[PDB]
């Protein structure tokens, strides 16, 4: 039933007695469900160190992965270019999912096409799909550039993207001088970040490989910035902000911040802003190229070093205090611009915040996950705050990266109880937060199911989630946030400390029981 003046949605509707009785009847009658006692027993077993040993012995089954597939990153990379249409050569189901995934994270349109390869193309190839696909897309959506990637179907059957695109130009489907960069992006190799790297390099090749004769390193007097797979608008924004403050001439290569943040003003803008083709053509004339996320930009690094002849600086992701200083000092050296008083002050306000909040942060224990660069930056900043990154999980991380993070943990007393996990997933992480319980989790929305499990064991065992990363689907507009630079450090500082203080307030809100510690001033 419903009272018209207080309509109940699913929750709390189905807590009503008649629904409760109905659902008990359904269960008892037809579900043949294990007794609750047996369910409790198995749940409790899933929280044990015994279960964890079995859990970590897994070599075939993956449960609740902390990664996505290559063409996801290729699309996001492709969106960062001016009036560019990402185009995934292969089956169409992939593109429905890619768009939907980003839709839900950014709460924006995400424009991307497929050439809809079917069963019959498997036996004979997707050449015709390419010809017609490219022609249709250019005519219908009017992009200035089409950036091509692949699904696993197309990769397994072994379609030569280069020839296919060339034959499309040869046969008049698209004009010969219409830019169509490509990249093979197999979803069974690496992860979504790998597709970003592959797509970017493919676009870098397209616009510069054949034109290197007339290029002088440093002639345009700019610095190229490659952001990598990046889902916070504030991060693109802060880098540009800090470089402009320094009076540093720059070129951000792959900038989707405009397309992923168009105004709702009565018209849909398919394309907006982005890195121009002219910027990519001129890029080799830069002083140098800086990779903001070097651990998934290996291929791009080799091309930039090998072809453009830029001596790419060895810089960590600009996250936290030390690595932002390093970033700014390196930029200063390359550009010959001094770090302005404004950025010096901002650094000091970050340090001021760190001294104000250090007592609540000190020794606090975290389980965290995400992509390699994001995770090591968070780990580094956590150490700088005097926090202990107890469980560091990176499903798409490698042996060399793990080495780099273990070294960072080694350089701090706050890394003594920390373990770095590569190749593991959030079901592994579930075990760790039961058996070696931290104070909080820092991760994406899939973590909400881990907090739910911990609460079920008991309130004293509940490990609250702190939502930083990708994807965040169950909160609104967190994609506008910043995690890079002093600004980003400040935002993380604030989230971390206030997460701790909200938790304390909950635990001390009991009248006459625990509210003796329910301080007005903290």
């Amino acid at each position: 039933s419903q009272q018209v003046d207080k309509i109940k949605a699913s929750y709390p509707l189905f807590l009503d007695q008649d629904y409760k009785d109905m659902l008990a009847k359904k269960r008892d009658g037809f579900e043949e469900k294990y007794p609750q006692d047996k369910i409790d027993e198995v749940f409790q077993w899933t929280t044990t160190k015994e279960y964890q040993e079995l859990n970590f012995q897994r070599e075939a089954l993956t449960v609740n992965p902390a990664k996505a597939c290559q063409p996801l990153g290729a699309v996001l990379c492709a969106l960062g270019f001016e009036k560019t249409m990402p185009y995934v050569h292969g089956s169409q189901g992939c593109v429905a999912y890619f768009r939907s995934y980003f839709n839900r994270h950014f709460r924006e349109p995400v424009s991307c096409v497929s050439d809809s390869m079917t069963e019959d193309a498997a036996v004979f190839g997707g050449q015709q799909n390419m010809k017609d696909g490219l022609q249709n897309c250019k005519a219908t959506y009017k992009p200035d550039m089409i950036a091509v990637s692949t699904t696993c179907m197309a990769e397994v059957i072994g379609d030569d993207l280069n020839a296919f695109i060339n034959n499309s130009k040869k046969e008049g489907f698209i004009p010969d001088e219409f830019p169509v960069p490509f990249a093979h992006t197999p979803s069974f190799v690496g992860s979504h970040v790998t597709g970003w790297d592959n797509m970017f390099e493919g676009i870098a090749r397209y616009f510069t490989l054949k034109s290197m004769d007339d290029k002088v390193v440093g002639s345009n007097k700019k610095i190229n910035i490659v952001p990598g797979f990046e889902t916070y608008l504030g991060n693109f924004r802060v880098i540009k902000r800090m470089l402009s403050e320094m009076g540093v001439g720059y070129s951000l290569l792959s900038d989707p911040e405009e397309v992923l943040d168009t105004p709702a003003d009565g018209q849909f803008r398919m394309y907006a802003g982005g890195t121009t083709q002219e910027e990519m053509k001129d890029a080799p004339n830069a002083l140098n190229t800086v990779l903001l996320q070097p651990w998934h930009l290996e291929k791009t690094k080799k091309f930039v070093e090998g072809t453009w002849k830029h001596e790419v600086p060895k810089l960590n992701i600009p996250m936290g205090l030390d690595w932002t200083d390093e970033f700014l000092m390196k930029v200063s050296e390359i550009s010959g611009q001094p770090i302005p008083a404004s950025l010096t002050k901002e650094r000091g306000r970050l340090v001021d915040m760190m001294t104000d909040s250090h007592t609540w942060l000190h020794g606090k224990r975290f389980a965290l996950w995400g992509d390699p660069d994001f995770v090591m930056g968070l780990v580094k900043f956590l150490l700088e705050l005097g926090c202990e990154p107890v469980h560091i999980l990176c499903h798409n991380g490698n042996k060399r990266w793990k080495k780099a993070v273990d070294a960072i943990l080694a350089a701090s007393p706050y890394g003594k109880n920390a373990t770095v996990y590569i190749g593991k997933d959030l079901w592994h992480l579930r075990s760790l937060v039961f058996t070696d319980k931290p104070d909080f989790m820092i991760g994406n929305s899939y973590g909400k199911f881990i907090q739910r499990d911990t609460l079920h064991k008991g309130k004293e065992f509940e490990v609250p989630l702190i939502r930083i990363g990708f994807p965040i689907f169950d909160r609104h507009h967190l994609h506008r946030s910043t995690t890079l630079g002093y600004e980003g450090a400040m935002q993380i500082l604030t989230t971390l400390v206030n997460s701790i203080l909200e938790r304390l307030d909950e635990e001390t809100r009991g009248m006459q029981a625990t509210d003796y510690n329910h301080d007005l001033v903290r």
């Binding site: 039933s1 419903q2 018209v4 109940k8 699913s10 189905f14 629904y19 109905m22 659902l23 009847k25 359904k26 009658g29 579900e31 043949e32 469900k33 369910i39 198995v42 749940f43 899933t46 079995l54 897994r58 070599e59 075939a60 089954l61 449960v63 609740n64 992965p65 990664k67 996505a68 597939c69 185009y87 089956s91 169409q92 189901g93 992939c94 593109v95 429905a96 839709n103 349109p109 424009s111 991307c112 096409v113 809809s116 079917t118 069963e119 498997a122 390419m130 017609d132 022609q135 249709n136 897309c137 219908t140 696993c152 179907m153 197999p186 069974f188 190799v189 709702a264 003003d265 009565g266």
Partner: protein, 468 residues
């Protein structure tokens, strides 16, 4: 105007090259239309794949089985908890719906085959998730392409472990959309699950046994339907698929009538059960009071005097509740014009609920519907209204620009486009994280949702006061 809509159609198609133009013209109409054909390359379809249809829609909701996304990491991750097929259970112990199980294919698996890995991951599933009552293995694109034999593994491991293991060859290159996945998924249930209790005679039947076929409990829809049927005196033995157990599926052959809500997704298994077990099936509609009342009476007529009396008692019970909803909300939405684009059922099935609030559906269309669906839609839609099968992003935007509806009801890939254009939008897949919309209790939520969005203050604020 028919003439106006027809000239809208020519104009829009003038952007295409010849190939695409001629094809798309056949998939657009004014009520005469083709469907269930290949999508034209590069035109930004809204369609998913056979995997989305089998795993995402039919099998995924089944709560006490574990469903393996067999292949690379993408598909299983992007579909993880995307559809709100609601269920009661303890996730990770005896229920598994929101989790993502996958073989996470690497290059060694593509080159050597993933058959030994699947066998190993079944052992790992059994060790770590003992209370699971079955496994299904949902093929992603590469499984068939590399020549794997998931049937043998299921046969072998299933016999070894005395457990139901279901191979589904729902690879994403198969078919033209999610629709073939439904069929494959239906056939997989038939072959590996539905006949398990054919020799079993212990089930205590009654004359009022019934099954809800093709309700996926989106936001609790199936629970809002179930409650009315059981108040009418019926016993719902099974819900296929929303909040569904494997044992319920296995008990379904014992029922007296299959109540089909989603025809497109579940008509195949419904035919089979009539052929094999003699069980009759009937389509019904539980969207809004008019269709719910019509449906409750049609269903009750298939039984006896006592059920039909209870039917009238239920209808009389809820009369004041839905009438209070319309009195409150119909005046807020009267005369407003809706454009819809959804999958295979709701583009026609939700029309009566709109009309019950005095709203007009001036356009509708399906992603993956067959001609038998369009036949069914002709009757429900008005004269001279716009029909579009497998609409392109470009077309849909262009139609809205001209038609200028007051409300648009579609999916997540459509939502943020039309919101920027200043047209209220409601997600008609996920119910915009609201619902249920089924039954009398659903209509109340539906009405409240259409009103909150259509009449929201934010829509009068799109133009800057100095932009005029």
């Amino acid at each position: 105007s028919r003439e106006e809509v027809e000239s809208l159609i020519q104009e829009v198609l003038e952007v295409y090259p010849e190939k695409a133009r001629k094809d798309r013209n056949k998939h657009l109409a004014v009520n005469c239309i083709i469907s269930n054909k290949k999508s034209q390359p590069g035109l930004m379809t809204i369609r998913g794949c056979a995997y989305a249809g089998s795993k995402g829609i039919v099998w995924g909701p089944i709560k006490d089985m574990i469903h393996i996304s067999h292949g690379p990491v993408g598909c299983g991750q992007y579909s993880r908890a995307g559809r709100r097929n609601y269920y009661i259970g303890t996730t990770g112990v005896n229920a598994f719906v929101t989790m993502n199980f996958t073989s996470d294919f690497q290059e060694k698996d593509i080159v050597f085959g993933g058959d030994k890995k699947l066998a190993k991951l079944i052992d790992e599933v059994e060790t770590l998730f003992p209370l699971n009552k079955g496994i299904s293995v949902q093929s992603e694109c590469p499984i068939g392409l590399i020549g794997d034999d998931i049937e043998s593994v299921s046969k072998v491991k299933g016999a070894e472990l005395s457990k139901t293991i279901v191979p589904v060859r729902c690879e994403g290159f198969r078919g033209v959309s999610q629709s073939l996945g439904h069929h494959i998924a239906n056939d997989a249930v038939r072959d590996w699950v539905l006949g398990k209790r054919d020799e079993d005679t212990t089930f205590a039947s009654t004359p009022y046994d019934v099954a809800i076929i093709g309700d996926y409990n989106i936001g609790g829809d199936a629970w809002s339907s179930r409650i009315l049927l059981e108040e009418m005196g019926l016993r719902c033995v099974a819900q296929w698929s929303g909040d569904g157990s494997i044992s319920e599926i296995e008990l379904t052959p014992k029922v007296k009538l299959n109540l089909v809500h989603c025809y497109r997704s579940m008509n195949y298994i419904s035919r089979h059960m009539e052929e094999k077990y003699g069980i009759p099936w009937m389509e019904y509609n539980f969207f809004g009071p008019t269709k719910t009342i019509e449906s409750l009476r049609a269903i009750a007529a298939k039984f006896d005097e006592s059920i039909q009396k209870k039917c009238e008692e239920v209808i009389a019970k809820y009369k004041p509740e839905w009438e209070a909803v319309v009195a409150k909300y119909r005046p807020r939405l009267e005369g407003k014009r809706v454009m819809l684009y959804i999958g295979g059922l709701r583009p026609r099935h939700v029309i009566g609920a709109y009309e019950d609030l005095g709203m007009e559906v001036v356009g509708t269309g399906y992603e993956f519907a067959h001609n038998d669906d369009y036949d069914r839609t002709m009757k429900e839609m008005g004269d001279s209204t716009l029909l579009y099968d497998d609409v392109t992003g470009y077309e849909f935007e262009e139609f809205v620009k001209r038609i200028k509806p007051d409300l648009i009801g579609s999916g997540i890939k459509e939502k943020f486009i039309f919101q920027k254009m200043g047209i209220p939008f409601r997600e008609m897949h996920s119910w915009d994280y609201s619902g249920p919309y089924h039954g009398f209790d659903g209509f109340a939520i539906f009405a409240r949702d259409m009103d909150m969005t259509l009449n929201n203050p934010c829509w009068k604020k799109l133009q800057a006061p100095w932009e005029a």
